[PDB]
Amino acid sequence: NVKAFDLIFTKLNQLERVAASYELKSCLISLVSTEYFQRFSNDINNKVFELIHDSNEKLGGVLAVDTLIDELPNQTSRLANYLRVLIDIEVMRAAATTLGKLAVLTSEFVEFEVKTCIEWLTQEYRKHASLLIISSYPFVNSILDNIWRALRKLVIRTDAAVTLGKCLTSSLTKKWVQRLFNGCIHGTLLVYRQLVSLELKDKYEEIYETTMKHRDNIIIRKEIYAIIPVLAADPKLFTQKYLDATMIHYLTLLLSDKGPILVSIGDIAYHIGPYLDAIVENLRDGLETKFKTRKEKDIFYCVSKLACAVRPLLAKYLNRGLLDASDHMQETLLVICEKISMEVTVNEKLLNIICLVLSGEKFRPPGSPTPMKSLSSETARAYRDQSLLRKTGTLDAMILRKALRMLSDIKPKYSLTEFIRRVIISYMEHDNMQVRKLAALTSCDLFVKSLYALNVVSEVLSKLLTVAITDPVAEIRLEILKHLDRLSQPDNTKLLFMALNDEVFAIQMEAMKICGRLAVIPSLRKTLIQLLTELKHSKMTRKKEECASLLCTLISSSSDVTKPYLEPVIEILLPSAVASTALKALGEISVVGGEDMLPFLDEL
């Protein structure tokens, strides 16, 4: 049972699997058995993982760390399994893992300098490990010696470096000391300039000097200087302006294309301007055609991030340009949103293939994966839907409907959920629509055919109301569905919303009694669910039914689980024989708080 989902997790796509499975595992574990089972098993899988390392082991292990978290045993199993799993990316894996596990500085600093200098003798991910760990002048000196040994990977070294530089942010003097020192290598000066210009007069001066120098080994210096220039960003601004324009026009046209374009983008972010804007428009044209020849618009992204400007001419020019160019659509979405309104509304009206107003024709069978560069058509499905969500932000209805039907099944979730939320926030009102309601509930019961249906029910319940009211034959079908699928608790709340006018409460009471006589442990779980249902129901009565039921629950107070608790809770909530039960139960639970404490809270 528990072992099942355990192995399922550990084995682990893999990531999310192990994640959710382990989450549920430790959660449902609910703290001679518990201790034993948990410790033994989990630690066995800690060794098992540390040996097995792919990353199934790793992932699930770190998950177990977080779960066991949510100090002695902590750091114990931490260093144990981590070092057992640590001398690809498993380095950074256990790095971050143990990092948050510890602090999210002794044995920490110990093993830090130890293993770091260990792999540093010819280290990096270990440096960054202890960096994030010790993150939120031992750091100063450590980092000094480290950066020495390693630099002259240098990436992860730079990670630990910027991490320390951050952590300190007196020490500014030691930092500026090491700064002038290194200032007195490619990767070295790269990381240096980066962290520095991110987080001083002649600092920035000599920066601009060496940087603009190397500006006029390629991509290395490209990114180094670029990152430096933006971070350090009037005299600075003007020197940066000149060097920027220079290198920009240099690279484009001549790799360095986007990079200098990126540095310029960051400058604009820091920042006729319309000349540079039209130049940026041509550059964006060629860049779109660059990713197109490739197939990157990130420049357009950062440019949008810079400001709103250049007016509808250049604005809509580039709009049409990039719109005709995978989250670039999303980036563009955010951009156009941040822009103004005109082009926003425009692209909103685009909707691609195949949608527009007018008209009441060409709806259902799209049906037409019209290729362009074409597809496997499914990309494009996840993306059809994503894009749909974005554009959203009868024709609407019909289109979205047919769509949702088609791409929900099959396979992957998507459409149904999407169009669900969509039409949800779309219509009603929609003052008088038969079709809206009908199709809505239609898709609803359609959903009755997993968790999709659940969250769908959430959205639906949100929408509600007189719709679901008219439903009530079909909503009764929905009530059946509610009963059936477990867990089934999900349905409960939904059902609760359905009250007033309906004939429900009869059937409700049915279910109630059913649970009552049902009076095993899983049946107790479902029972609790039912209790909750009663709570949420919050309709009224059946008075004495409620009384006797409550009595049954009172019997059920003994042993079991917090089910009994919440049972009393909800019971009370709605809304006397009171005393005897009350006193006995309560006082007990008080005495009995240790250890349930669900029980005590309930009692309250």
Added chain:
Amino acid sequence: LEGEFNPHLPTILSLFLDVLENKKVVSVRILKSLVVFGPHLEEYVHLVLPTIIKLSSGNLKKAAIITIGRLSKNNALEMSSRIVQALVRVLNETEYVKATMNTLSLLLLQLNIDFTVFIPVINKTLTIYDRLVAKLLNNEPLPTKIIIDKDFDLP
């Protein structure tokens, strides 16, 4: 016959309790006494029934389950759709026997609800009488025809 509804029902609870507890005798007497009950109000019982049924003393046990259920039912639309999904998924051993038992079960208990079938139309993929009565219905009603599938029901 009927008494009490309750005296039965709790005793019925003891019974299903035993039922959950692979002795073929279990399954046999199970489906048997199931049919014996017939009407009416046993509900949680009926779920456990659908539940115990969802376990798939063997396949044929589960088949007979589906049958007896259909009979005594001829509501829960809940457990209906539930076990519907169950078997129809099991639907790509019993697969023949299952095809019949489930087809029949459906026709029996169903429909007036096009939903179930419509889904099950898809879910089927992969068987006639079911389909026949289904489309027939889709056009317009028709009684009986279930006698074909099963018989007793022995008084």
